[PDB]
Short mmCIF file of all heavy atoms in Angstrom, two decimals:
data_model
loop_
_atom_site.label_atom_id
_atom_site.label_comp_id
_atom_site.label_asym_id
_atom_site.label_seq_id
_atom_site.Cartn_x
_atom_site.Cartn_y
_atom_site.Cartn_z
N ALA A 240 -7.65 -11.75 13.96
CA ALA A 240 -7.73 -13.07 14.57
C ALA A 240 -7.24 -14.15 13.59
O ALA A 240 -6.56 -15.12 13.97
CB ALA A 240 -9.20 -13.35 14.99
N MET A 241 -7.61 -13.97 12.33
CA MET A 241 -7.32 -14.97 11.33
C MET A 241 -5.84 -15.01 10.98
O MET A 241 -5.32 -16.07 10.68
CB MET A 241 -8.24 -14.85 10.12
CG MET A 241 -9.71 -15.25 10.43
SD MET A 241 -10.03 -16.95 10.96
CE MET A 241 -10.04 -16.82 12.76
N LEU A 242 -5.18 -13.86 11.08
CA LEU A 242 -3.74 -13.76 10.90
C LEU A 242 -3.00 -14.53 11.99
O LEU A 242 -2.00 -15.19 11.71
CB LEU A 242 -3.33 -12.30 10.92
CG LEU A 242 -2.87 -11.53 9.66
CD1 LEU A 242 -3.04 -12.20 8.28
CD2 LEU A 242 -3.37 -10.10 9.65
N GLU A 243 -3.49 -14.42 13.24
CA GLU A 243 -2.93 -15.16 14.37
C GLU A 243 -3.19 -16.66 14.16
O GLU A 243 -2.33 -17.47 14.47
CB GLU A 243 -3.50 -14.65 15.72
CG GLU A 243 -3.20 -13.15 15.96
CD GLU A 243 -3.42 -12.63 17.40
OE1 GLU A 243 -4.36 -13.09 18.11
OE2 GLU A 243 -2.66 -11.72 17.80
N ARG A 244 -4.35 -17.00 13.60
CA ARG A 244 -4.67 -18.38 13.27
C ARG A 244 -3.71 -18.95 12.23
O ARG A 244 -3.22 -20.09 12.36
CB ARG A 244 -6.11 -18.51 12.78
CG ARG A 244 -6.47 -19.93 12.39
CD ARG A 244 -7.94 -20.21 12.32
NE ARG A 244 -8.14 -21.60 11.91
CZ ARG A 244 -9.12 -22.40 12.35
NH1 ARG A 244 -10.05 -21.98 13.22
NH2 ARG A 244 -9.17 -23.64 11.89
N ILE A 245 -3.43 -18.17 11.20
CA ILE A 245 -2.48 -18.60 10.16
C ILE A 245 -1.07 -18.83 10.76
O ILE A 245 -0.38 -19.76 10.39
CB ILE A 245 -2.39 -17.58 9.00
CG1 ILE A 245 -3.69 -17.55 8.21
CG2 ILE A 245 -1.17 -17.89 8.08
CD1 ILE A 245 -3.87 -16.25 7.40
N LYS A 246 -0.66 -17.95 11.66
CA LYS A 246 0.65 -18.06 12.33
C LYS A 246 0.76 -19.35 13.15
O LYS A 246 1.84 -19.95 13.24
CB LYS A 246 0.89 -16.84 13.24
CG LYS A 246 2.32 -16.69 13.74
CD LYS A 246 2.50 -15.56 14.76
CE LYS A 246 2.63 -14.17 14.09
NZ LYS A 246 3.52 -13.20 14.85
N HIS A 247 -0.36 -19.77 13.73
CA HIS A 247 -0.37 -20.91 14.62
C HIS A 247 -0.67 -22.24 13.93
O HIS A 247 -0.10 -23.26 14.29
CB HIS A 247 -1.36 -20.66 15.76
CG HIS A 247 -1.34 -21.71 16.82
ND1 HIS A 247 -0.19 -22.04 17.52
CD2 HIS A 247 -2.32 -22.52 17.30
CE1 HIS A 247 -0.47 -23.00 18.39
NE2 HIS A 247 -1.75 -23.30 18.28
N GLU A 248 -1.55 -22.23 12.92
CA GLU A 248 -2.21 -23.43 12.44
C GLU A 248 -2.12 -23.67 10.94
O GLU A 248 -2.49 -24.75 10.46
CB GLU A 248 -3.71 -23.30 12.74
CG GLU A 248 -4.22 -24.03 13.93
CD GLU A 248 -5.72 -24.20 13.87
OE1 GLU A 248 -6.21 -24.96 13.00
OE2 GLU A 248 -6.42 -23.57 14.70
N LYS A 249 -1.70 -22.64 10.20
CA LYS A 249 -1.75 -22.62 8.72
C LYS A 249 -3.11 -22.98 8.09
O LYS A 249 -3.19 -23.69 7.08
CB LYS A 249 -0.60 -23.43 8.08
CG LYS A 249 0.80 -23.08 8.61
CD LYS A 249 1.17 -21.63 8.36
CE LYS A 249 2.42 -21.23 9.15
NZ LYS A 249 2.53 -19.76 9.33
N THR A 250 -4.18 -22.47 8.71
CA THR A 250 -5.52 -22.60 8.16
C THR A 250 -6.26 -21.29 8.40
O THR A 250 -5.89 -20.52 9.29
CB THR A 250 -6.29 -23.72 8.84
OG1 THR A 250 -6.38 -23.45 10.24
CG2 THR A 250 -5.60 -25.07 8.64
N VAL A 251 -7.29 -21.02 7.60
CA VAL A 251 -8.30 -20.01 7.96
C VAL A 251 -9.66 -20.67 8.19
O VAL A 251 -10.02 -21.63 7.49
CB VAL A 251 -8.43 -18.86 6.91
CG1 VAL A 251 -7.26 -17.92 6.99
CG2 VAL A 251 -8.57 -19.42 5.51
N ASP A 252 -10.40 -20.20 9.18
CA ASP A 252 -11.84 -20.49 9.23
C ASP A 252 -12.62 -19.20 9.47
O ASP A 252 -13.14 -18.96 10.56
CB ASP A 252 -12.20 -21.57 10.25
CG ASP A 252 -13.68 -21.98 10.18
OD1 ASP A 252 -14.42 -21.52 9.28
OD2 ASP A 252 -14.12 -22.78 11.04
N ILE A 253 -12.66 -18.36 8.43
CA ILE A 253 -13.38 -17.08 8.43
C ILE A 253 -14.86 -17.30 8.71
O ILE A 253 -15.43 -16.61 9.54
CB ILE A 253 -13.19 -16.33 7.10
CG1 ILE A 253 -11.70 -16.03 6.86
CG2 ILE A 253 -13.98 -15.02 7.09
CD1 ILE A 253 -11.32 -15.93 5.39
N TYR A 254 -15.45 -18.27 8.05
CA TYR A 254 -16.86 -18.59 8.27
C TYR A 254 -17.15 -18.88 9.75
O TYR A 254 -18.06 -18.29 10.36
CB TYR A 254 -17.30 -19.76 7.36
CG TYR A 254 -18.76 -20.14 7.49
CD1 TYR A 254 -19.74 -19.49 6.74
CD2 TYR A 254 -19.16 -21.13 8.39
CE1 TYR A 254 -21.10 -19.83 6.87
CE2 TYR A 254 -20.51 -21.48 8.54
CZ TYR A 254 -21.48 -20.82 7.78
OH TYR A 254 -22.81 -21.17 7.93
N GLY A 255 -16.36 -19.78 10.34
CA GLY A 255 -16.55 -20.17 11.73
C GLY A 255 -16.35 -19.03 12.71
O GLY A 255 -17.08 -18.92 13.71
N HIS A 256 -15.36 -18.19 12.46
CA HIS A 256 -15.14 -17.04 13.32
C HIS A 256 -16.25 -15.98 13.25
O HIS A 256 -16.63 -15.40 14.28
CB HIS A 256 -13.77 -16.40 13.09
CG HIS A 256 -13.30 -15.58 14.26
ND1 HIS A 256 -12.94 -16.16 15.46
CD2 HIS A 256 -13.17 -14.25 14.43
CE1 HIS A 256 -12.61 -15.21 16.31
NE2 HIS A 256 -12.74 -14.04 15.71
N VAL A 257 -16.77 -15.71 12.07
CA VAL A 257 -17.84 -14.72 11.94
C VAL A 257 -19.08 -15.21 12.64
O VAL A 257 -19.73 -14.44 13.36
CB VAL A 257 -18.12 -14.31 10.45
CG1 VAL A 257 -19.24 -13.31 10.37
CG2 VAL A 257 -16.87 -13.69 9.85
N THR A 258 -19.38 -16.52 12.49
CA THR A 258 -20.47 -17.14 13.24
C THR A 258 -20.29 -16.91 14.74
O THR A 258 -21.25 -16.62 15.45
CB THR A 258 -20.63 -18.64 12.93
OG1 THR A 258 -20.91 -18.80 11.54
CG2 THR A 258 -21.79 -19.24 13.68
N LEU A 259 -19.05 -17.06 15.21
CA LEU A 259 -18.76 -16.88 16.64
C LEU A 259 -18.96 -15.42 17.04
O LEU A 259 -19.57 -15.11 18.07
CB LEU A 259 -17.32 -17.33 16.96
CG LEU A 259 -16.96 -17.28 18.45
CD1 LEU A 259 -17.64 -18.43 19.16
CD2 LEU A 259 -15.43 -17.28 18.73
N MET A 260 -18.48 -14.51 16.20
CA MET A 260 -18.60 -13.09 16.54
C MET A 260 -20.08 -12.60 16.53
O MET A 260 -20.46 -11.73 17.30
CB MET A 260 -17.73 -12.25 15.62
CG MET A 260 -16.18 -12.33 15.91
SD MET A 260 -15.42 -11.50 14.54
CE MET A 260 -15.90 -9.83 14.74
N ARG A 261 -20.90 -13.19 15.66
CA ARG A 261 -22.34 -12.91 15.62
C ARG A 261 -23.05 -13.33 16.89
O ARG A 261 -24.12 -12.82 17.18
CB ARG A 261 -23.02 -13.63 14.43
CG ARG A 261 -22.67 -13.05 13.08
CD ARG A 261 -23.53 -11.85 12.68
NE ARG A 261 -23.03 -11.29 11.43
CZ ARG A 261 -23.35 -11.73 10.22
NH1 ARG A 261 -24.26 -12.73 10.06
NH2 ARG A 261 -22.79 -11.15 9.16
N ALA A 262 -22.50 -14.29 17.63
CA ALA A 262 -23.08 -14.65 18.93
C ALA A 262 -22.74 -13.61 20.00
O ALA A 262 -23.32 -13.62 21.09
CB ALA A 262 -22.62 -16.05 19.38
N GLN A 263 -21.80 -12.71 19.70
CA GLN A 263 -21.36 -11.73 20.70
C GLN A 263 -21.88 -10.33 20.47
O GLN A 263 -22.05 -9.58 21.44
CB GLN A 263 -19.84 -11.73 20.84
CG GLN A 263 -19.33 -13.10 21.40
CD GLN A 263 -17.82 -13.12 21.54
OE1 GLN A 263 -17.10 -13.07 20.55
NE2 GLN A 263 -17.34 -13.13 22.80
N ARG A 264 -22.14 -9.99 19.20
CA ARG A 264 -22.67 -8.67 18.84
C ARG A 264 -23.42 -8.74 17.51
O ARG A 264 -22.94 -9.40 16.57
CB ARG A 264 -21.53 -7.64 18.71
CG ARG A 264 -21.99 -6.20 18.49
CD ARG A 264 -20.82 -5.20 18.71
NE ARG A 264 -21.19 -3.82 18.39
CZ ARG A 264 -21.88 -2.98 19.17
NH1 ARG A 264 -22.32 -3.34 20.37
NH2 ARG A 264 -22.15 -1.77 18.70
N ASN A 265 -24.58 -8.09 17.43
CA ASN A 265 -25.38 -8.15 16.21
C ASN A 265 -24.61 -7.64 14.99
O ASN A 265 -23.87 -6.67 15.09
CB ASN A 265 -26.79 -7.45 16.38
CG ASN A 265 -26.74 -5.99 16.91
OD1 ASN A 265 -27.80 -5.41 17.23
ND2 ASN A 265 -25.55 -5.40 16.99
N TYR A 266 -24.77 -8.35 13.88
CA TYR A 266 -24.40 -7.87 12.53
C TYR A 266 -22.91 -7.84 12.24
O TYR A 266 -22.53 -7.34 11.18
CB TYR A 266 -25.00 -6.47 12.20
CG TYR A 266 -26.41 -6.15 12.72
CD1 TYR A 266 -26.65 -5.03 13.51
CD2 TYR A 266 -27.52 -6.94 12.37
CE1 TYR A 266 -27.96 -4.72 13.97
CE2 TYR A 266 -28.83 -6.62 12.83
CZ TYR A 266 -29.03 -5.52 13.63
OH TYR A 266 -30.30 -5.19 14.11
#
Side-chain angles (χ1 to χ4, degrees):
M241 290 299 95
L242 252 10
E243 300 194 325
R244 178 161 179 144
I245 292 159
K246 193 186 278 213
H247 187 58
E248 259 198 68
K249 308 300 168 201
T250 60
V251 286
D252 186 6
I253 300 152
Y254 181 87
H256 202 70
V257 179
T258 299
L259 185 74
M260 287 170 67
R261 289 276 174 85
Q263 295 180 294
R264 186 166 175 80
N265 53 188
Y266 322 125

